[PDB]
């Protein structure tokens, strides 16, 4: 097509240890939602990771609710939602 793309193959051939984690992060960025519902026949690791993910979402929701309930400035909804997302994410 003519566009410029870097030589990813040689970079993987010379730095496979870094590109393992790079690929894992890229995969974790866009992970499709599970169509199948979790049940009692799944592995213990799967239910542990599912509980960890649900705990992560509950922590994020609780922190967002707490900071929104504080209402520091009493004041652009997209800007305040973005800033609230960043402060919840790094807090």
């Amino acid at each position: 097509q003519g566009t410029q793309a870097d030589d990813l193959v040689s970079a993987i051939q010379q730095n496979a240890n870094h590109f393992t984690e790079l690929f894992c992060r890229a995969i974790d960025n866009n992970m499709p939602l599970p169509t199948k519902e979790i049940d009692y026949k799944d592995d213990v690791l799967d239910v542990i990771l599912n509980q960890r993910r649900l705990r992560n979402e509950r922590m994020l929701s609780d922190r967002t609710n707490e900071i929104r309930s504080e209402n520091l400035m009493d004041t652009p909804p997209s800007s305040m939602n973005d800033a609230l997302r960043e402060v919840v994410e790094d807090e």
Binding site: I67, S79, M80, D82, E86
Partner: protein, 31 residues
């Protein structure tokens, strides 16, 4: 102040925040 300062510069359009100083005054009995 960490969560006040983050919500401010991203809305009224790196930065490091030091430990804030407590200055406290009173009108109680004077020894």
């Amino acid at each position: 102040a960490k969560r006040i300062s983050i919500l401010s510069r991203a809305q009224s359009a790196l930065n490091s925040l030091p430990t804030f100083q407590l200055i406290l005054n009173s009108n109680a009995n004077q020894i």
